[PDB]
Amino acid sequence: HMASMKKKGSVVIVGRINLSGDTAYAQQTRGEEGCQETSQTGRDKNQVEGEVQIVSTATQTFLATSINGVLWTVYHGAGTRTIASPKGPVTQMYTNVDKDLVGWQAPQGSRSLTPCTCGSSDLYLVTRHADVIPVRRRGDSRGSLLSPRPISYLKGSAGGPLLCPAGHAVGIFRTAVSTRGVAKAVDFIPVESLETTM
Ligand X SMILES: CCc1nc2ccc(OC)cc2nc1O[C@@H]1C[C@H]2C(=O)N[C@]3(C(=O)NS(=O)(=O)C4CC4)C[C@@H]3/C=C/CCCCC[C@H](NC(=O)OC(C)(C)C)C(=O)N2C1
- Residue 135 DSSP SS3: strand
Shortest reach from residue 154's CB to ligand X, in Å? 4
User: 164 labelled as ligand-binding?
Assistant: yes
- 119 contacts 162 by C-beta, under 8 angstroms: no
Of the pair 151, 166, the CB lying nearest Zn ion is at 166
**In angstroms, what is the minimal distance from the CB of 183 to ligand X?**
7
Binding site partner of 71, from Zn ion, ligand X, none, Cβ cut-off 5-8 A by kind? none
118 assigned to a ligand binding site:
yes
The answer on whether 35 is annotated among ligand-binding residues is no
Shortest spacing between CB 77 and ligand X, in angstroms: 3
**Contact residues: ligand X, CB under 6 A:** 60, 62, 74-77, 97, 100, 151, 154-158, 173-178
CB of 142 to Zn ion, least distance (A): 18
Q: Is 168 annotated as a binding residue?
A: yes
Distance, CA of 9 to CA of 3 (rounded, Å) = 17
Helix, strand, coil abundance in the chain, percent, nearest 5: 15, 45, 40
Distance CA 159, CA 77 (A): 8
Which member of 8, 129, 138, 168 binds Zn ion (CB under 5 A)? 168
Task: Determine if 116 is a binding residue for Zn ion (CB under 5 A).
Answer: yes
Q: H helices within the chain, ranges in order? A: 32-41, 75-78, 191-197
Cα–Cα dist 175/62, whole Å: 12
CA proximity to 103, closest of 144, 53, 138: 53
Q: Give the total of residues touching Zn ion (CB under 5 A).
A: 5
Closest-CA residue to 96 (of 76, 110, 82, 115): 76
Query: Cα–Cα distance between 131 and 124 in angstroms, integer?
Result: 9
Smallest gap from Cβ 185 to Zn ion, in A, equals 21
**Closer by beta carbon to Zn ion, 91 or else 114:** 114
Q: Which is nearer to ligand X, 118 or 132 (CB)?
A: 132
Site residues, Zn ion (CB under 5 A) = 116, 118, 164, 166, 168
- Which residues are annotated binding-site positions for Zn(2+)? 116, 118, 164, 168
